[PDB]
Paper text:
Here cryo-electron microscopy analyses of human CE pre-B complex and B-like complexes reveal extensive structural similarities with their CI counterparts. Add-back experiments using purified CE pre-B complexes, coupled with cryo-electron microscopy, elucidate the order of the extensive remodelling events that accompany the formation of B complexes and B-like complexes. The molecular triggers and roles of B-specific proteins in these rearrangements are also identified.
To elucidate whether disruption of U4/U6 stem III is a prerequisite for the final positioning of BRR2, we extended the 5′ss oligo (henceforth called 5′ssLNG) by 8 additional nucleotides that are fully complementary to U6 snRNA nucleotides 31–38 that form part of U4/U6 stem III. Cryo-EM of the complexes formed after incubation of affinity-purified CE pre-B with 5′ssLNG, followed by ATPγS (designated pre-B5′ssLNG+ATPγS) revealed the formation of an extended U6/5′ss and the absence of U4/U6 stem III. In addition, the U4 Sm core has moved upwards by about 5 nm (compared with pre-B5′ss+ATPγS) and now contacts BRR2. However, the position of BRR2 and the conformation of the BRR2NC RecA domains are not substantially different from pre-B5′ss+ATPγS. These results point towards an essential role for one or more of the B-specific proteins in these BRR2 structural rearrangements.
Author numbering:
A (entry chain A): 245 to 438
B (entry chain A): 1120 to 1314
C (entry chain B): 36 to 57
D (entry chain U): 100 to 555
E (entry chain G): 241 to 255, 270 to 274
F (entry chain A): 585 to 633
G (entry chain C): 116 to 951
RNA sequence: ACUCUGGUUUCUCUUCAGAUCGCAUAAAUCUUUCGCCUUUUACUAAAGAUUUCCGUGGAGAGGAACAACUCUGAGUCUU
């Protein structure tokens, strides 16, 4: 019952703010719903052929699609009343959920392009030699030596960060049986695949 | 200083925006100039020529259409020479013109029924329907037919090209039928024969 | 089938005014 | 230095310079170094190589320009200063230098001034251009003009700069633009016999926000009520100036005795006890007025039995009879009525009479087209003051100066102005550019809306 | 057929019964 | 509900809910009848509607 | 609170920094963490990022910073010394490069931000170059370290490998831009910081050594701060750091003593939060109550990392000792910024930043109020002292010593130093600091040299704000009702003031034109123009691109031009320049201020130009950095040099303006060489005036250009996209649809995301930022910036080409379609005539 | 490591609600704008403004249950 979406960049023009924009513009995202116009403005639809919007002065290379006028509702269109903005391109979280039941939690799985460390050019930095004016106390150590680098509940905990809204809470209030839309995140998806 | 001569420029909004006369700067200035020249001739006390109740249509290098409602017939004259290709006859409300000196199809007059005539006919049907307290069905339908052929024999070819007029005609005929059916019985029937 | 009048908008593809009236 | 002489002096066109537009660059939208071409009359960004003014000079071959800040002329294509004896006249148009003697020798002036276009006129009697629904603005500006106490404070630029302007002061532009416009219209020598308030309505709409928008015809009374208040408030920064140049001219002290709860819902005994309670009686409500309001009798609403559709003519003294202890008006509001009687205790040097023509009914706003018969050069107001104050004033006689007449419905109006040229007696009618010396009877025949007086 | 459709779209832009 | 109970004939607005539920069905079914499930009356995901 | 002013008075404990970085790299969150460190009452929400410096609403809704925000804050150091920090967190979007430059002129330090999982990106590639060109100390802070652990789950060794790969790539890339060889960045040296803004993690090697010293004790954190980064290791038996491996499965010191503890602590606070969390907080001295342990994972992680590391001392000591103070950095800033340099009296007066010396503060921003009426200028007081109510003199950008008319004497109304949302009113601001001056908005557009009246007689102005990109996209603006046109003029002026590279312009056809960098930039500027300044309705034309005019071959005939008097006669030839010569002009490689010998050797060696002309080159295209060139090539026997030198100025004046306009249409002329083959000047200075030569100059330039085969040059945006490998084809298909072509597709090391670098025509790139994300369902993302200009396919001057109204034309028609509509947009004639 | 520290759960009453009261979402009435328009009762589908409905948070008060097992900050935090 849970889509495996980590970020919301998949909801680029299917956010509810974009739908508010589409409603206030009497325009429809191809996957989005249709609405009655906020204001009829039929006369304003029938704007005359001026020297501003003259065709012969306009260069058409790629048509100005509806989603263009929705992404930038103050540039590609006129009269943007009761319009909302959304460009929340959150840095697309690069999360690789584990599939191996047996694996180090911090593993360099092949889904990551190798760093390919090199030493061709002698790009040296200030470095010491052996037994060069320094000595470490016997007491001092890395902070956490006894505790393991990763426990068994480390992969599950990390994979739980990017869980959907209900499953990223350690604790929370109780909701009614009525108020839990199980398939809410289904029609909110971009489209049905064919 | 503000190019403010276009804010109140009347235009035939029914036609498509390409067919509608285009408001270029030079053309709007010329139209307002010509109207002012005409208006200044007549004394303001003898009579007056109001701009808002007037229409000026200009044909120039920028506008290929000449628009005017002569006697209720909104006509758009479009020369063949300027902007035309493969002229036809499949539309019945499009007058072919003729250059009498040369006998060649050189223009094209698109006909249409203006908003005033459509509104007048709709109001006539309305006042037929509301004036039916005791009038017989035959009287109502006789008034309806008389009103219908009052304009249809008048507006003949324009009715074909005025889709909204056709919709209004069908709507008003359905209103007449509904009035008669309600006159028969209160509860409207599911079907009702045309016979 | 119903007695309601259908608008002949879009019904004029193959007809003329002077046809069937000579 | 070839600066002084120029081979392009004659190319200047004096009838094309219309200095009533916004002094901002046309090409690149800037106010800095606003330089104006004299050949054709366009605005530019300033001097310098490859500059907009320089580009225009080397493109149109227009050589001699004008600086709107230093008021020093230049030849941009070679970019050197220009000095000429005749050219000085142009500098007198945009910035008229009214030295104190010209103010002192202007109420005694009876010579018609000369305009470059030939359109003769008298200073002060100048048509304000109606760009867009500026009839009310032109009317109030002209009526505020011809006020010598206000006339002698704005013809010199060195009168209102010294005032303190707080950091948040955003209304001094109103005062300075009013002064500059007044200098433009009071100019004895200008190219055009008219003047455009284009630079003034912008300050009006900036200070008053979208209110009094030039799109729709504004209300005269609602206008000057805010206008005089704004002039009073602008003069003085972070310092209570109860008396400024406009306060000691139009403002007058006024006494009001107000009784409340005369409502008929109260029985006779309860109202008798209420007035016996000593809580609801005439009260000390002395305050100030910027202008006296005049309330007219309602329209007859019926044809006269003998002469149908008789024009309602009411003497002015009947209206002014409101301002005495004899009469009291019931300004009923909300639940309980308020019976107020008015009184005058300090006559201002100039008395303003606003007239309540336009009023809203229960459903729709109408106008009260009641004509008033009012004199123009002899009126006595001594009966409207208490004797313990009447002794102070030895001058209670007022002479009309400006009159406002409105046309038609509120939504379709066209203001007209009757101005008196002091020194002479020529009453001139100005609507947009109209000039006509009317007789002292057409002032009485028309229905007045705003009147300006002078106690002498 | 994409070209004709997109040009047509450009021209568009710049110019009782209980049924369940 | 509309087929089983004729309540929509007594309040028209109910059609919304009616259509709403049917739409929900379609949403769940196309997600239910996937792969080797096939088509049939074997869905009991009633909490959606 | 008054200690703020006391430290304000000093000029050596002050730092001027910019946290410049790529789009969405945590800069705003970093400043938010600093605010949360300083102000206790300001607490960030559990889930929603507070975004303290994002003060305007449009960036609060779009989620992207748009305008730089000043932050004045007192930060303790590692040793506990307070420092006053001026922070200019520039917007990260490459289309918002305006504010990066606007905040970089008034700052001495550059603190870079790089996403740990993203590496070096497009933006940073230009900020390192820009900061080096502006002569600022550059420091890197790899932000979002958490991504290498909580998202990538890399092994700690591979985490160090990623960190060193992104650290040395900065060093490797910057070696092209930086001439000096002291600019090598490395965390052991102290240039590089590591931080996760969301979880408040921040450290330099010195700071972490301070933590260990704090815990164990008797540790010198400097020596141990060294010997941490590198390939050296730690021997648990000999307690010495060795280059060689002490064991077979050895581990680098940094990973062993820094990255591994971070891994363990954050894994313990995200895994086994209920069993082994108290054990790992007892071992670290972090004591927490019951109620602060019942929060969610993200707030708990942030709280625990705040408790463990503590205050942001690592960033502070990273900044203090690696960027110069204003008293130290003033000399390079002045010699690169002041027009006269340090040599002039005022120039030498700046090398010491005397608080009591001459005041010539420099303002480079306009932060409007909440009503939008008045504009509060923002600037750095490079020297002198300013006071409230002081009568000051504001200069301009065209103000010189000869042109004393471009200035105004104003009154500084109030003074306050601003930290994001709230401002602190101060009566006096000393030198070397920042300030919002009030009441100086009227005589300024963009930059200004606000100086003393009648006290700085020979003082010049600061150099114009040079940018990295170019304003390319062009949109028309009109009011809906022309009856309120003046309401829109002031709004256009206001947006021109509040946007450094915005270029308003009125053209002959009465058209208002706004120039911008990208789609989002124009969206923001028009939102400001509508809902903020003008509060009226505005019609916008669909975006169009400015073009350029060039040549490819010499003219068939030596077309000339004569004055109307038929006395002077100038003959000129237009020919293309050498490939790459145009770039070597716009990059300030050669100037007109050069002496003749140096330019002659330059053109003799690099461009093998003959010395007979190499010492006869007058001007460099329009303005000073113009890519065109004027060449004197008349033989001395036919053209008298003494007679030539009189019109030597006027010809350039008609040329520097001749190439600006362009004969085909009102567009720049680029990559053209003008050879003069014959000059017949009037023997007397009477009839050879500028009013006759300059029209003749422009006419001969236009005639040579037209007779030479002309071409249009369209600007190509350089687009990088980052998408997972499954969407690389989804980028190829989109870019092939808009005449684009891909240059590279390099996977980012240490991350599955790729980086596809391509070129796309700017006129063909409208909506591509949305045409890509929607096609890839939001996984891909693109950024665009102008790169170069290319000859538009086809001949712009062919009459057989027919322009259909509303459908795209093929490539050969483009050069004809683009200009003609442009000409129609310019209001000019339909075609071009030889008379022009 | 000495101290005092001292409950949570449950059922009600009374108010205040800023906030996604609610990570959910209905109905009614009224005023406009359409659609239909044949009259109510249903509608139409958007806007605005209301009300009831299913719920909620906080604070206080009053009982009951673990009211007495605890427990927490404070402290001089006593080899
Ligand atoms: O018309 P729908 O509502 O979509 O449903 C009908 C059908 O019966 P109903 O018309 O009475 O629903 C079944 O739907 P259910 O009876 O199962 O609700 C069937 O579904 P199964 O194949 O799962 O039995 C199938 O619905 P769908 O197309 O959603 O699978 C079918 O639809 P059509 O008759 O429209 O093809």
């Amino acid at each position: 019952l849970l889509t495996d979406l980590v970020d919301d960049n998949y909801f680029y023009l299917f956010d509810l703010k974009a739908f508010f924009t589409s409603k206030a513009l009497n325009m429809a995202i191809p996957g989005g719903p249709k609405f009655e116009p906020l204001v009829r403005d039929i006369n304003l639809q029938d704007e005359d052929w001026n020297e501003f919007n003259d065709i012969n002065k306009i260069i058409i290379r790629q048509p100005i699609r509806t989603e263009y006028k929705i992404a930038f509702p103050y540039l590609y269109n006129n009269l943007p009343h009761h319009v909302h903005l959304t460009w929340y391109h959150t840095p697309n979280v690069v999360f690789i959920k584990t599939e191996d039941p047996d694996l180090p939690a911090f593993y360099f799985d092949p889904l990551i392009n190798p760093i390919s460390h090199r030493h061709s050019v002698k790009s040296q930095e200030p470095l010491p030699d052996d037994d060069e004016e320094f000595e470490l106390p016997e007491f001092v150590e890395p902070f956490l030596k006894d505790t393991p680098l990763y426990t068994d509940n480390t992969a599950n905990g990390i994979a739980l960060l990017w869980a959907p809204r209900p499953f990223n809470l350690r604790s929370g209030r109780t909701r009614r049986a009525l108020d839990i839309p199980l398939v809410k995140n289904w029609y909110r998806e971009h489209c049905p695949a064919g | 200083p503000n190019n403010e001569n276009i804010v109140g420029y009347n235009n035939k909004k029914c036609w498509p925006r390409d067919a509608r006369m285009r408001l270029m700067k030079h053309d709007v200035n010329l139209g307002r100039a010509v109207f002012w020249d005409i208006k200044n001739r007549l004394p303001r006390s003898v009579t007056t020529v109001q701009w808002e109740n007037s229409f000026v249509s200009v044909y120039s290098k920028d506008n290929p259409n000449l628009l005017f409602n002569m006697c209720g017939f909104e006509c758009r004259i479009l020369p063949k020479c300027r902007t035309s290709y493969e002229e036809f006859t499949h539309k019945d409300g499009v007058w072919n013109l003729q250059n009498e000196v040369t006998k060649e199809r050189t223009a094209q007059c698109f006909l249409r029924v203006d908003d005033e005539s459509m509104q007048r006919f709709h109001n006539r049907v309305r006042q037929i329907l509301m004036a039916s307290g005791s009038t017989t069905f035959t009287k109502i339908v006789n008034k309806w037919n008389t009103a219908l052929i009052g304009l249809m024999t008048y507006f003949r070819e324009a009715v074909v090209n005025t889709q909204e007029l056709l919709d209004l005609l069908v709507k008003c005929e359905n209103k007449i039928q509904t009035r008669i059916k309600i006159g028969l019985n209160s509860k409207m029937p599911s079907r009702f024969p045309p016979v | 089938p119903t007695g309601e009048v259908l608008s002949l908008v879009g019904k004029l593809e193959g007809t003329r005014m002077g046809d069937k009236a000579q | 230095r070839r600066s002084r002489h120029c081979p392009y002096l004659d190319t200047i066109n004096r009838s094309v310079l219309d200095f009533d537009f916004e002094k901002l660059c046309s090409i690149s939208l800037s106010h800095i170094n606003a330089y104006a071409c004299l050949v054709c009359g366009k605005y530019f960004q300033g001097r310098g190589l490859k500059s907009h003014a320089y580009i225009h000079s080397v493109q149109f071959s227009h050589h001699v320009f004008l600086n709107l800040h230093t008021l020093k002329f230049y030849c941009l294509p070679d970019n050197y200063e220009i000095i000429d004896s005749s050219l000085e006249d142009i500098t007198y148009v945009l910035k008229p230098t009214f030295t104190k003697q010209q103010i002192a020798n202007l109420d005694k002036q009876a010579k018609l001034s000369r305009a470059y276009d030939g359109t003769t006129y008298l200073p002060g009697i100048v048509g304000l251009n109606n760009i867009k629904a500026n009839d009310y603005a032109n009317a109030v500006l002209q009526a505020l003009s011809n006020v010598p106490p206000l006339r002698n404070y704005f013809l010199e630029e060195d009168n209102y700069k010294n005032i303190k302007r707080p950091p948040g002061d955003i209304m001094f532009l109103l005062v300075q633009r009013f002064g500059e416009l007044m200098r433009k219209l009071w100019n004895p020598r200008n190219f055009k016999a008219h003047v455009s308030p284009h630079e003034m309505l912008q300050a009006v709409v900036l200070c008053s926000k979208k209110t009094f928008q030039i799109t729709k015809q504004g209300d005269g009374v609602d206008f000057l009520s805010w206008f005089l208040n704004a002039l009073h408030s602008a003069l003085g920064g972070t310092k209570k100036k109860k008396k400024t140049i406009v306060t000691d001219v139009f403002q007058g002290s006024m006494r009001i005795f107000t009784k409340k709860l005369p409502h008929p819902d109260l029985p006779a005994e309860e109202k008798e006890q209420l007035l016996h309670n000593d809580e609801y009686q005439e009260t000390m409500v002395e305050s100030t007025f910027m202008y006296l309001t005049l309330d007219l009798p309602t329209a007859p609403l019926y044809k006269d039995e003998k002469e149908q559709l008789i024009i309602p003519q009411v003497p002015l003294f009947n209206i002014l009879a409101k301002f005495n202890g004899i009469t009291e008006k019931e300004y009923k509001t909300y639940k309980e009525n308020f019976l107020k009687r008015f009184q005058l205790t300090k006559l201002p040097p100039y008395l303003i009479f606003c007239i309540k023509r336009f009023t809203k009914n229960n459903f729709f706003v109408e106008k009260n087209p009641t004509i008033v018969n009012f004199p123009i050069t002899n009126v006595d107001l001594r009966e409207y003051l208490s004797e313990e104050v009447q002794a102070v004033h030895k001058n209670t006689t007022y002479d009309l100066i400006a009159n406002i007449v409105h046309d038609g419905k509120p939504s379709e109006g066209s203001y007209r102005i009757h101005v008196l040229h002091h020194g002479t007696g020529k009453w001139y009618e100005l609507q947009d550019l109209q000039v006509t010396d009317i007789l002292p009877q057409m002032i009485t025949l028309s229905e007045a809306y705003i009147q300006i007086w002078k106690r002498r | 057929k994409d070209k004709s459709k997109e040009l047509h779209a450009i021209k568009e832009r710049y110019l009782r019964k209980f049924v369940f | 509900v509309g087929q089983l109970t004729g309540m929509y004939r007594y309040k028209y607005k109910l059609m919304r809910q009616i259509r709403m539920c049917k739409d929900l069905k379609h949403l769940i079914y196309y997600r239910f009848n996937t792969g080797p499930v096939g088509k049939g009356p074997g869905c009991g995901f009633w909490a959606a509607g | 609170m008054d200690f703020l002013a006391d430290l304000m008075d000093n000029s050596e404990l002050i730092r001027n920094v910019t946290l410049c970085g790529h789009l969405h790299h945590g800069k705003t969150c970093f400043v938010d963490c600093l605010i949360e460190q300083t102000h206790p009452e300001i607490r960030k929400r559990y889930d929603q990022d507070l975004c303290y410096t994002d003060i305007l609403f449009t960036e609060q809704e779009r989620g992207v910073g748009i305008k730089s925000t000043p932050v004045t804050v007192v930060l303790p150091d590692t040793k506990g010394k307070s420092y006053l920090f001026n922070i200019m967190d520039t917007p990260g979007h490459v289309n918002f490069s305006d504010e990066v430059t606007a905040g970089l002129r008034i700052s001495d330090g550059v603190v870079l931000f790089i996403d740990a999982a993203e590496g070096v990106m497009l933006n940073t590639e230009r900020l390192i170059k820009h900061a080096v060109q502006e002569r600022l100390a550059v420091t890197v802070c790899i932000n979002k370290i958490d991504r290498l652990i909580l998202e990538l789950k890399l092994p700690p060794t591979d985490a160090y490998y990623k960190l060193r790969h992104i650290v040395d790539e900065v060093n490797g890339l910057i070696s092209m831009y930086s001439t000096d060889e002291n600019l090598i960045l490395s965390p052991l040296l102290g240039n590089v910081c590591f931080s996760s803004s969301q979880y408040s993690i921040c450290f330099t090697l010195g700071s972490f050594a301070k933590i260990y010293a704090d815990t164990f004790g008797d540790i010198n954190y400097q020596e141990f701060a060294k010997r941490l980064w590198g390939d050296i290791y730690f021997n648990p038996k000999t307690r010495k750091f060795t280059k060689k491996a002490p064991t077979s499965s050895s581990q680098r010191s940094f990973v062993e003593f820094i990255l591994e503890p971070l891994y363990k602590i954050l894994a313990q606070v995200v895994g086994d939060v209920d069993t082994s969390l108290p054990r790992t907080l007892d071992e670290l001295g972090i004591h927490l109550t019951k109620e602060e342990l019942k929060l969610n994972i993200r707030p708990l992680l942030r709280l625990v990392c705040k408790k463990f590391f503590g205050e942001f001392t690592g960033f502070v000591d990273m900044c203090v000792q690696h960027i110069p103070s204003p008293k130290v950095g003033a000399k390079p800033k002045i010699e690169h910024t002041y027009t006269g340099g340090v040599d002039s009296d005022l120039g030498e007066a700046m090398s010491d930043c005397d608080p009591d010396g001459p005041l010539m503060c420099h303002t480079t921003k306009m932060y409007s109020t909440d009503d939008g009426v008045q504009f509060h200028a923002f600037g750095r007081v490079l020297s002198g002292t300013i006071h409230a109510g002081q009568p000051v003199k504001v200069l301009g950008e065209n103000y010189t010593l000869e042109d004393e008319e471009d200035s105004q004497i104003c009154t500084v109304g109030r003074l306050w130093i601003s930290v994001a949302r709230y401002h602190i009113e101060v009566n006096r601001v000393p030198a070397g600091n920042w300030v919002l001056i009030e009441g100086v908005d009227q005589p300024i557009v963009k930059t200004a040299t606000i100086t003393e009246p009648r006290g700085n007689e020979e003082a010049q102005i600061f150099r114009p704000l040079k940018f990295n990109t170019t304003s390319v996209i062009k949109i028309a603006v009109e009011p809906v009702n022309p009856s309120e046109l003046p309401k829109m003029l002031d709004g256009l002026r206001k947006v021109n003031k509040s946007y450094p590279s915005l270029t308003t312009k009125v053209e002959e056809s009465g058209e208002h034109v706004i120039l911008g960098t990208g789609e989002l930039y124009l969206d923001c500027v028009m939102h400001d123009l509508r809902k903020m300044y003008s509060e009226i309705d505005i019609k916008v034309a669909d975006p169009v691109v400015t073009f350029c005019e060039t040549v490819v071959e010499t003219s068939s005939l030596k077309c000339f031009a004569e004055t109307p008097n038929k006395k002077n006669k100038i003959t000129m030839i237009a020919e293309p320049l050498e490939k790459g010569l145009a770039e070597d002009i716009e990059n300030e490689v050669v100037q007109i201020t050069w002496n003749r010998k140096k330019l002659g050797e330059f053109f003799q060696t690099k461009y093998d130009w003959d010395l007979l002309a190499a010492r006869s080159i007058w001007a460099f295209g329009p303005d000073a950095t113009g890519p065109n060139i004027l060449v004197d090539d008349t033989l001395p026997s036919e053209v008298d040099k003494a007679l030539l030198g009189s019109v030597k100025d006027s010809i350039v004046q008609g040329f520097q303006w001749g190439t600006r306009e362009g004969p085909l249409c009102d567009e720049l002329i680029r990559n053209v060489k003008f050879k003069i083959l014959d000059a017949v000047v009037a023997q007397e200075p009477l009839h050879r005036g500028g009013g006759q030569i300059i029209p003749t100059a422009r006419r001969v330039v236009y005639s040579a250009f037209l007779m030479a085969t002309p071409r249009l040059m369209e600007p190509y945006y350089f687009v990088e996209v980052q998408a997972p490998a499954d969407c690389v084809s989804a980028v190829y298909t989109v870019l092939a649809r808009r005449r684009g072509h891909v240059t590279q597709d390099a996977p980012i090391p240490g991350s599955p995301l790729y980086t596809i670098k391509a070129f796309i025509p700017a006129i063909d790139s409208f909506g591509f930022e949305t045409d890509l994300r929607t096609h890839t369902q939001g996984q891909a993302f693109s950024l665009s910036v102008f790169h170069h200009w290319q000859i538009v396919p086809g001949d712009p001057l062919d009459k057989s080409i027919v322009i259909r109204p509303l459908e795209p034309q093929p490539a050969p028609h483009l050069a004809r379609e683009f200009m003609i509509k442009t000409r129609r947009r310019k209001g000019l004639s339909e075609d071009v005539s030889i008379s022009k």
